Amino acid sequence: NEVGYDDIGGCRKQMAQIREMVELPLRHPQLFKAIGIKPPRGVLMYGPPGTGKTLMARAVANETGAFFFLINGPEVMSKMAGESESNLRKAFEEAEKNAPAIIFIDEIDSIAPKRDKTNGEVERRVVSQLLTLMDGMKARSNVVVIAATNRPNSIDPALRRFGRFDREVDIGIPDATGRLEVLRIHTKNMKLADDVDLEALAAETHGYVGADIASLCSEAAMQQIREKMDDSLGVTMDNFRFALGNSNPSALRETVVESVNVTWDDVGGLDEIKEELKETVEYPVLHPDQYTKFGLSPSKGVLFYGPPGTGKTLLAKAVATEVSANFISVKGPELLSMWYGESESNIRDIFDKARAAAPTVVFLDQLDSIAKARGGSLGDAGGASDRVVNQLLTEMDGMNAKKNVFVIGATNRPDQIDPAILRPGRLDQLIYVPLPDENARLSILNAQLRKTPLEPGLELTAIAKATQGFSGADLLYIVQRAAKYAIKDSIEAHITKEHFAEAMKTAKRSVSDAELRRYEAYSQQMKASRGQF
Amino acid sequence: NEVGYDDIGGCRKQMAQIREMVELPLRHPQLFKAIGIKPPRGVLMYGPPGTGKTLMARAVANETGAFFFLINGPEVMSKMAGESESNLRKAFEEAEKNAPAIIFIDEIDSIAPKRDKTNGEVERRVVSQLLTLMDGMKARSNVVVIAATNRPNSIDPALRRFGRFDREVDIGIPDATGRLEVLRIHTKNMKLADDVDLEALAAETHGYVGADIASLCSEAAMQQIREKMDLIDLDEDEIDAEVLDSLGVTMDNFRFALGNSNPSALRETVVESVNVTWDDVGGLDEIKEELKETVEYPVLHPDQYTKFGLSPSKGVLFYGPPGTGKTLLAKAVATEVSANFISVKGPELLSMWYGESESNIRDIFDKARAAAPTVVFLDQLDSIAKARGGSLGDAGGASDRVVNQLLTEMDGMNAKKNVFVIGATNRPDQIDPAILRPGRLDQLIYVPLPDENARLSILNAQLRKTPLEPGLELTAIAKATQGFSGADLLYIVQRAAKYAIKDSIVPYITKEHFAEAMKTAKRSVSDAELRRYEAYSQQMKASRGQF
Amino acid sequence: ADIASLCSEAAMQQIREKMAEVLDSLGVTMDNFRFALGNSNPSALRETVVESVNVTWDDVGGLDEIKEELKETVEYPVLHPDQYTKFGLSPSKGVLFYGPPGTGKTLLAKAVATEVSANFISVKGPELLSMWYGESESNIRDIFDKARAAAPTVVFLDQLDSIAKARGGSLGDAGGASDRVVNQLLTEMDGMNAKKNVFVIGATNRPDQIDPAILRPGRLDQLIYVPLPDENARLSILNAQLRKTPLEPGLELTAIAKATQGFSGADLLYIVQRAAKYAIKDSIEA
Amino acid sequence: QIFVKTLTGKTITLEVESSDTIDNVKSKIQDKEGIPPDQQRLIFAGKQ
Ligand SMILES: Nc1ncnc2c1ncn2[C@@H]1O[C@H](COP(=O)(O)OP(=O)(O)OP(=O)(O)O)[C@@H](O)[C@H]1O
Ligand SMILES: Nc1ncnc2c1ncn2[C@@H]1O[C@H](COP(=O)(O)OP(=O)(O)OP(=O)(O)O)[C@@H](O)[C@H]1O
Ligand SMILES: Nc1ncnc2c1ncn2[C@@H]1O[C@H](COP(=O)(O)OP(=O)(O)O)[C@@H](O)[C@H]1O
């Protein structure tokens, strides 16, 4: 009636750490060093709720037969003050009768929050009691405590110390094969049919977790029971399609940490800039010896400028595939939409989170605010005027150069930008994104016509020859303007080329001609005036 | 006295959803062995007060024949912290040996309020004892716990997780046929008169809950006592016990009971629908079949609209001349698809105190999931630009408190939840570009000048709330204004109807009230503003991006 | 306290690398310390970084007239503290630089404090300003108390073209707020404790419109012009970043240095920063 | 060039002063308190 290693999945890279971080003291204290044993117990696991922090801690406990003692934060915080001091001593006295044991402690952020709002004796009493018994169990009793919370910045930093709490384990959202793996776990006894899907709904769940997967399989199976009575049971895929329209997205106010698998051939053309990015960042992530054999530093920030919104988000998606790392999508106008404090602390609360999730890459957009929001002295705005320019000169050079966090940037108009900080070395890879070629956008349009059927008597090069102000994203409304008539004639009476004329000229036009001659004013001098412009 | 199925009414469609959800783990546990997934244990009812949610819990317990136990709300908080946890532990132990059983708890808002606003000591005492006892029990005794409150997001959010409380059930107000069934149960002992009609009182009280209907008939029966007060006084201690048989509550006492009472649960807007058709406004037929191609096509054919890879047409806009029927069309946009709809406005709902300015948009997202379908509509987009903020220069944005909760969850909901945002502005040059993006407002519905030659048909459906003169004069009442829509046409009606209080202590409506009303024939919506956007109606495809 | 953990942080990876029969892996390697430095949690990183960097004087080429002048102002009080007390006159506290933005006038000031192991605090002119009203004068004197408590420290005021330009020219509403923010640092230059070895170092472009009450003696009296370095002192710049070259150049680098006087002191430093686009790119395909 | 001013408010305390469980008082009765110097307490025997 217990669990094992096969009952959890998705988490594999730091689970392979935690399967040996605690087994190495517990299985054998002798074969560790046999001269001086230094067990760094006090593992601090963290992450969003519903990630199975308790279930993954019981997996290693039931595998080695360890006694899993469990307590929680608010269940011992809301008791009497003298009673919580005795009950913590009643919890740590089990370290000698069940050794090797496991002491699970949860919700320490409620126990030890940040020390700005409170100045009290009783508020610091419950955290000083565990300080007085952390050195009391220093007689090598072969026990390892487990600390589980939401995030490490909520814990008081005096607890995180070498000797008490040094081990940090991050538990995030699983990948596309991770939620596929927990879908196989929760359906080990689910008697389904042959028509069910395993991969389409798995990749569609972006901000979902295995606890949300557990509600997805139960709600879809409950819908199957509703239309049977009104052995004669059978679960189809359409019950899970009902669960797709009745799901509960919980993780929404968090940046995506999952890596993607989109190839560089999804976009058309610009092959000369994919090799320039491949010769800079995906070589030192496998071996950084190329930058140290001649004394150089990796890149800090890149730039993109030209026609705005022409598919630079998918270009920022595809850089996390040739480097075999993750990707962080920070929005463009969030530098101005965030208030005072939110424009400073939130942009560095993801940076140290990116250090724990190394290797990764960060995407930024709308970098034309440095030349317009420098002299902030007005008494109306808060962090949207002056609290951006004072920190991007420090936070871009405030890296550690050992975990290789990377910043992807993109702007629109680089002629008004001052060349003071735009010198190479920090902002080195300033790139002009050009207008896409005729074979470039039809390679994108072949991927846009992949999701729909089409007759082979249609041609797309008849509209590409007259593209004076039509980019690849400017022609994305062709599948909306022309294909709006193919739905009406099929559903009214109980894909062709007839609607190609209604989207010939009046489909969509965004790229103008005044800035089109301005897009090559800097590009013609990118070989001579490369330093400043 | 025990209750059954006939003692409740109005929520018969809602009761059947709670019926199959609680009777399957109680009666037939063989479906759990066949499908191999855990049935739910905790349901949660909520809604307006006075809808008989405590009566429904006693009805589902006695008819199923299970061991019923009741735990009321304030009786737990009337004790201290010590004996309240011991009484909660004793209730769950006796229901385990008496399987199947229903442990119905009531008033969870008094036990579990919102904890983060008042970080306290007792706010995590009795709920942490309950949470280790609810999630901690495991004996396959197939017992069901039922919760009840008045607001779903007033409780602590940790209770609405998997395994503890998953199925949310809304208890709405009854309809016209539903409120008729409520009074028939209460009037089983009330000796009414023969002139009292059954279906007439249902259409009288539009938004009365079942507690309000039960207090309405008792006040009308109390007026029958005070009507017969002069017949027999109170000094005789029930001596003349022979005239009390002639005590019939006739129907004008209910008319007097409606004149003194007031709606109690109508402090918010309508929860079901509004009903004003497109024929109630005159003309605008060039957009009637145009809007039929964008909002009622995907909800009727969800497969052919999405298998071609086209995005759902979620958002439309209404623009053109300012104040020219788009404010009149604020209510006449819901009856086409006949879905649920709640209008939002700047000074109406999002201008409250801090903390409640985003909870109103949270209710329309629970209406996207728990009360599907839904229709969202925001009017007067130029007044909300003062709260959103204007982007200046080349580096700007709308730093607003409410747009962060709006724009993120309006795109995360798929087409099966039936989300439909409707826009209506007065000038497209006063629209913030930070909210506009390709993928939200790609459907152009241009509202032209509202048919000044045919505006007589607009006012024909406007003067139907008052008995008027049969010899009307509709020659040149609205064809000489050309800037006065149906909203400002009330001022012409107010000109021809404010003279009823004058020349009094007789004629009420004459033909001179409309013939002499053309002396204030002005134009607030000039033609200089219309012709700027008449050419924009055919060239917005080249300006469908930032501006 | 962190060093007691880094010996254990690399010892467990040696056991993890394998899994005298199992104790031969206990001999730690020099790259496992680099792995322990790769996932290192620095104690200075847990707060603001106020440590002294390991920069020296051999990393730059030229600017030796500034180096002989900047060896007497802040080093002679702290190396020989009894010399100025014999005459009873403390040395001058404050040095001002002015010139083009290409030379290392803001970048060589870190080598001045770190030689005698002094702290470095770099503040920028258009970094903190008066957003609301009067929210700058409290944020100027808030660093003077900790500048003398953790002594030796220096403070590096930089880019004074936002404050020291407005004395009697700007007469607007922002000019009225300009008159309220410039007298804070003007009274703090002579009101500071000059016996706690606290020094100001300035380096500001556009030296014509400087305020006349800051070029007075006692605050900024070392009129040291910093142009681009000399054309014969540009080969000694490249001794820091690269040392290993199998062909040993140094005559072609001085050929383009002596070609024109318009080349900056940072542009010729970038001719070896482009080595990853010139020589390291076509030599790693093996 | 503006300001933000906000005040605060507090609630002090309430008390009950409940104590003296019955099991502590039953142990409180069966004890001794001490006897001066020569105040013996005696034994006794009988009923052969
Ligand atoms: N990586 C995972 N993330 C989430 N759930 C998982 C995972 N692996 C397995 N599960 C299963 O999904 C369920 C998720 O609920 P679970 O209580 O584990 O989440 P939790 O956040 O750890 O809970 P708590 O917040 O109480 O620690 C578990 O019952 C578990 O069996
Ligand atoms: N089928 C029914 N539907 C709605 N109302 C009913 C029905 N039958 C009776 N009523 C009336 O509605 C009232 C039921 O309200 P109830 O006592 O449940 O208050 P409540 O606020 O729902 O309870 P709680 O305090 O638990 O929330 C009764 O007084 C009764 O007259
Ligand atoms: N002697 C030097 N020759 C060439 N470049 C230098 C020299 N000293 C510093 N630099 C460059 O200048 C930068 C530091 O000074 P700098 O930023 O130019 O200050 P400022 O812009 O205020 O003149 C460093 O990044 C460094 O690469």
Written as one string, the DSSP assignment of A497-528 is STTTTTTSSSS-----STTTTTTTTTTTTTTT
Contact A407, A396 (CB under 8 A): yes
Closest residue, chain D, to C134 (C-alpha):
D1
Q: How far apart are CA A190 and CA A185, in angstroms?
A: 10
Reported structure resolution in angstroms: 3.9
* Assigned token pair, A164: 């008490």
H or E, element range at B528: helix B527-534
DSSP letter at B218 equals: H
Bridge-based pairing state of the strands A301-305 and A328-329: unpaired
Which residues on C lie below 8 Å from A161 (Cβ)?
1
Q: What angle do CA A63, A65, A70 make, to 5 degrees?
A: 100
Q: Which atom of ligand 1 is nearest to the CA of A171?
A: 1
Q: How far apart are CA D32 and CA B329, in angstroms?
A: 92
Which residues on A lie below 8 Å from C124 (Cβ)?
390, 393
Contact A243, A219 (CB under 8 A): yes
SS3 content of chain B, % helix, strand, coil (to 5): 35, 10, 55
Q: How far apart are CA A485 and CA A463, in angstroms?
A: 19
* Closest-CA residue to B486 (of B463, B512, B519, B516): B463
Contact B111, B146 (CB under 8 A): no
* Assigned token pair, B396: 């700007």
H or E, element range at A480: helix A478-481
Q: Which atom of ligand 2 is nearest to the CA of B214?
A: 31
Residues forming beta bridges with residue A305, ordered by sequence position: A432
H or E, element range at C120: strand C119-124
Residues in contact with A436: Cβ distance below 8 Å, sequence separation at least 6, in sequence order: A268, A269, A270, A310, A444, A471, A472
Q: Is C160 in the pocket of ligand 3 (CB under 6 A)?
A: no
Q: CA of C222: how far to CAs of C71, C73, C91, C200, C225, in Å? A: 13, 9, 12, 12, 9
Edge-to-edge strand list for the sheet holding B375-379: B341-344, B375-379, B421-424, B315-319, B443-446
- Chain breaks of chain C after residues with C–N above 2.5 Å: 19
Chains in contact with B, where contact requires at least 3 CB pairs less than 8 Å apart: A
* Assigned token pair, A390: 């004072």
Residues in contact with B296: Cβ distance below 8 Å, sequence separation at least 6, in sequence order: B336, B337
Residues in contact with A237: Cβ distance below 8 Å, sequence separation at least 6, in sequence order: A193, A195, A196, A197
Closest residue, chain A, to C1 (C-alpha):
A162
Instruction: Give Cα B298 distance to the centre of its chain.
Output: 24
Q: How far apart are CA B29 and CA B39, in angstroms?
A: 9
Distance C208 CA to ligand 3 centre (A): 22
* Assigned token pair, A368: 């034309």
Q: CA of C117: how far to CAs of A454, B236, C120, C122, in Å? A: 74, 107, 9, 16
Contact A439, A265 (CB under 8 A): no
Q: Give yes or no for C172 touching D (CB within 8 A).
A: no
The DSSP annotation for B134-171 comes to: HTT--S----EEEEE-S-TTSS-GGGSSTTTS-EEEE-
Angle between helices A237-244 and A210-226 (to 10 degrees): 120
* Assigned token pair, A466: 């007259």
Contact A442, A461 (CB under 8 A): yes
* Assigned token pair, C197: 């070895």
Q: How far apart are CA A296 and CA C276, in angstroms?
A: 8
Q: Is C105 annotated as a binding residue?
A: yes
Q: CA of B418: how far to CAs of A245, B298, B299, B411, B415, in Å? A: 9, 9, 8, 12, 5
DSSP letter at C158 equals: E
Q: Residue type at C227?
A: P
* Assigned token pair, A41: 């117990």
Residues forming beta bridges with residue B112, ordered by sequence position: none
Residues forming beta bridges with residue C119, ordered by sequence position: C153
Q: How far apart are CA C143 and CA B348, in angstroms?
A: 49
Q: Is B6 in the pocket of ligand 2 (CB under 6 A)?
A: no
* Assigned token pair, B4: 């059954």
Q: What angle do CA B392, B398, B402 make, to 5 degrees?
A: 160
Q: In the PDB record, what is the listed experimental method?
A: cryo-EM
Phi, psi of A516 (to 5 degrees): -70, -35
Residues forming beta bridges with residue A273, ordered by sequence position: none
**Is the bond preceding residue C152 a cis peptide, omega within 30 degrees?**
yes
* Closest-CA residue to A240 (of A258, A215, A260): A215
For chain D, the farthest-separated pair of C-alpha atoms sits apart, in whole angstroms, at: 105
Q: How far apart are CA B531 and CA B287, in angstroms?
A: 19
Which residues on B lie below 8 Å from A471 (Cβ)?
none
Contact A344, A387 (CB under 8 A): yes
Instruction: Give Cα B70 distance to the centre of its chain.
Output: 31
Q: How far apart are CA B102 and CA B61, in angstroms?
A: 7
* Assigned token pair, D41: 């307490």
Q: How far apart are CA B14 and CA B385, in angstroms?
A: 41
Angle between helices B53-64 and B12-27 (to 10 degrees): 40
Which residue segments constitute the domains of chain D, with CATH numbers given? 1-48 (3.10.20.90)
A217 alpha carbon, closest ligand: 1
Instruction: Give Cα C155 distance to the centre of its chain.
Output: 10
Q: Is C237 in the pocket of ligand 3 (CB under 6 A)?
A: yes
Q: Is A398 annotated as a binding residue?
A: no
Nearest-neighbour CA in chain D from C134: distance (Å): 8
The DSSP annotation for B414-445 comes to: -GGG---EEEE-S-GGG--TTT--TTTS-EEE
Long-range contacts of C249-257 (CB under 8 A, 24+ apart): C257/C231, C257/C232
Contact C85, C103 (CB under 8 A): no
* Closest-CA residue to A54 (of A79, A71, A75, A74): A71
Q: CA of B486: how far to CAs of A323, B452, B497, in Å? A: 63, 11, 16
Residues in contact with B464: Cβ distance below 8 Å, sequence separation at least 6, in sequence order: none
Angle between helices C3-18 and C30-38 (to 10 degrees): 110
Q: How far apart are CA A199 and CA A177, in angstroms?
A: 9
Dihedral over Cα of C2, C7, C8, C10: its sign: positive
In which residue are the tokens 């686009």 written? C277
Q: Residue type at A307?
A: P
Contact A434, A268 (CB under 8 A): no
Q: For the beta carbon of residue B104, count every other beta carbon within 10 angstroms.
A: 21
Contact C153, C118 (CB under 8 A): yes
H helices of A65-110, where? Answer: 73-77, 81-91
Distance A212 CA to ligand 1 centre (A): 9
Q: For the beta carbon of residue B499, count every other beta carbon within 10 angstroms.
A: 14
The closest residue, in CA terms, to atom 23 on ligand 3 is C101
H helices of A351-436, where? Answer: 351-356, 389-395
Residues forming beta bridges with residue C157, ordered by sequence position: C123, C202
Nearest-neighbour CA in chain C from D2: distance (Å): 6
Q: For the beta carbon of residue A411, count every other beta carbon within 10 angstroms.
A: 23
Residues in contact with B399: Cβ distance below 8 Å, sequence separation at least 6, in sequence order: A336, A337, A338, A339, A384, B389
Q: CA of B250: how far to CAs of B137, B192, B206, B211, B527, in Å? A: 56, 6, 21, 21, 60
Q: How far apart are CA A400 and CA A358, in angstroms?
A: 12
Contact C185, C140 (CB under 8 A): yes
Contact B542, A509 (CB under 8 A): yes
Q: Residue type at B25?
A: P
Distance C265 CA to ligand 3 centre (A): 7
**Is the bond preceding residue C212 a cis peptide, omega within 30 degrees?**
no
Q: How far apart are CA B444 and CA B538, in angstroms?
A: 10
- Dump strand ranges (E) for A233-365: 301-305, 328-329, 360-363
Contact A305, A412 (CB under 8 A): yes
Q: How far apart are CA A146 and CA A154, in angstroms?
A: 17
Residues forming beta bridges with residue C158, ordered by sequence position: C124, C203
Contact B7, B59 (CB under 8 A): yes
Bridge-based pairing state of the strands B101-105 and B67-71: parallel
* Assigned token pair, A496: 């062709």
Q: CA of C72: how far to CAs of A521, C110, C182, C189, in Å? A: 50, 16, 29, 20
- Dump strand ranges (E) for A13-64: 43-46
* Assigned token pair, A68: 């899993």
Contact B44, B92 (CB under 8 A): no
Contact A455, A499 (CB under 8 A): no
* Closest-CA residue to C10 (of C27, C45, C43, C35): C35
* Assigned token pair, B369: 């999931």
Burial label, B430 (beta-carbon count in 10 A; 0-12, 13-18, 19+) = middle
Residues of A at the C interface, defined by Cβ within 8 angstroms: 20, 24, 31-34, 38, 40, 157, 161-163, 166, 279-280, 283, 290-291, 293-296, 374-379, 385-386, 389-390, 393, 400, 402-403, 420, 423-425, 531
Would the CB atoms of C280 and A294 count as touching at under 8 Å?
A: yes
* Assigned token pair, A444: 């994108």
Q: CA of B272: how far to CAs of A29, A265, B372, C113, in Å? A: 68, 50, 11, 74
Nearest-neighbour CA in chain C from A523: distance (Å): 19
Q: Is A393 annotated as a binding residue?
A: no
Q: For the beta carbon of residue A416, count every other beta carbon within 10 angstroms.
A: 11
Q: How far apart are CA A198 and CA A181, in angstroms?
A: 10
Write the secondary structure of B18-71 as one string of H (helix), E (strand) and C (coil).
Answer: HHHHHHHHHHCCHHHHHHCCCCCCEEEEECCCCCCHHHHHHHHHHHHCCEEEEE
In which residue are the tokens 């913030």 written? B432
A191: nearest CB among B24, B36, B310: B36
Angle between helices B176-186 and B210-227 (to 10 degrees): 50
Q: Is C107 annotated as a binding residue?
A: yes
Residues in contact with B103: Cβ distance below 8 Å, sequence separation at least 6, in sequence order: B69, B71, B91, B92, B95, B143, B144, B145, B146
Contact A294, C244 (CB under 8 A): yes
The DSSP annotation for B243-298 comes to: STT---B-HHHHHHHHHH---SS-SS--SS-----GGGS---TTTHHHHTTTSSHH
Q: What angle do CA A407, A411, A417 make, to 5 degrees?
A: 105
Q: For the beta carbon of residue A531, count every other beta carbon within 10 angstroms.
A: 13
Edge-to-edge strand list for the sheet holding C119-124: C119-124, C153-158, C200-203, C95-98, C222-225
Q: CA of C13: how far to CAs of A363, A416, B250, in Å? A: 33, 51, 92
